């Protein structure tokens, strides 16, 4: 296909003061850009290996494909989950699903925050939808491992806990970054992803 | 180019009494046959996904590709590492490299045996060649993870320690299986693989 870096739906500084412009610029234009460039290179190498039936090469390329491929997937979703018009609480069917599956919105916040802060090293915190069980589910993924590709869950809301996502502003205080990000969550986008899972 | 199950270079009972015919027949005609068939099915699914640029599908298929792909690679080498003409000790440059890197042939035997018996669960014990360092190296791989694809080492001699490789004959006494396999090692094939790395 030849993947490309998607344009951001807002200005790099639109999420201030919760996430500063310098992080957004570096996070989008440098880290994400690298994943897309390396993903395209990795996909081209795998196509050659498949043509020659080189199983050894296919397996050797799996870490680069998952790492760069997942990085493209994860960050592409991440940008749509944020908005300068975000924050507050969700409404409608998504709010009802959260109460049913987690009890209340506040308890959901605590569990997703704990899952994200509890990540040892680099990874992601995710609110996902389990098609088999038909309910919401919280999961954490290491490094750039994508939720759906590795767990089967449909991603609804992702929290990047890579140090590059918060270290320029919040230093080592990961909880402060988690507390601040709730102010810019685009619940409209999360709702659209949730409704897409239902019939 | 479509992978196929290789024919065994000897009769199923040629390795008796060290490895009985029932294990060889089941190991080759049942287990290996499934890996090659499932490998081909997996490659077709990945080829379609790669054409559409579906990164999620590519990542979801990685476990099946590594498991079935590695199984095809590992067992295809395994059969060539055994021979009714095997046993004894290696000669020539291979014997010299073993003494240099391991001290003596007996010490190499002890180290590869320990690596194979020490595998927790299913996996493989391997004598490999390190292209970067230009010396021999022993490594263990879990499940069907192939040596070269995951470590870069060139496989010279592999020991299958999956329970299906010995449980019918040696029950839970894995050390007895390792003791018997040394009598049927095809050092001629190991030498040809080793010499192919040097130039
Ligand atoms: Mn990131
Ligand atoms: Mn086996």
Curated annotation (Swiss-Prot), chains A, B:
Keywords: Acetylation, Manganese, Metal-binding, Mitochondrion, Nitration, Oxidoreductase, Transit peptide, Ubl conjugation. The modification 3'-nitrotyrosine is found at residue 35. The modification N6-succinyllysine is found at residues 45, 52, 99, 107. It catalyses: 2 superoxide + 2 H(+) = H2O2 + O2. One of its GO terms (cellular component) is mitochondrial nucleoid. Its main location: mitochondrion. It is found in: Mitochondrion matrix. InterPro entries: Fe/Mn_Superoxide_Dismutase (IPR050265), Mn/Fe_SOD (IPR001189), Mn/Fe_SOD_BS (IPR019833), Mn/Fe_SOD_C (IPR019832), Mn/Fe_SOD_N (IPR019831), Mn/Fe_SOD_N_sf (IPR036324), SOD_C_sf (IPR036314). Mn(2+) binds at residues 27, 75, 160, 164. GO terms for molecular function: DNA binding; enzyme binding; identical protein binding; manganese ion binding; oxygen binding; superoxide dismutase activity. It comes from the Eukaryota. Destroys superoxide anion radicals which are normally produced within the cells and which are toxic to biological systems. Homotetramer. Belongs to the iron/manganese superoxide dismutase family. This is Superoxide dismutase [Mn], mitochondrial. It comes from Homo sapiens (Human).
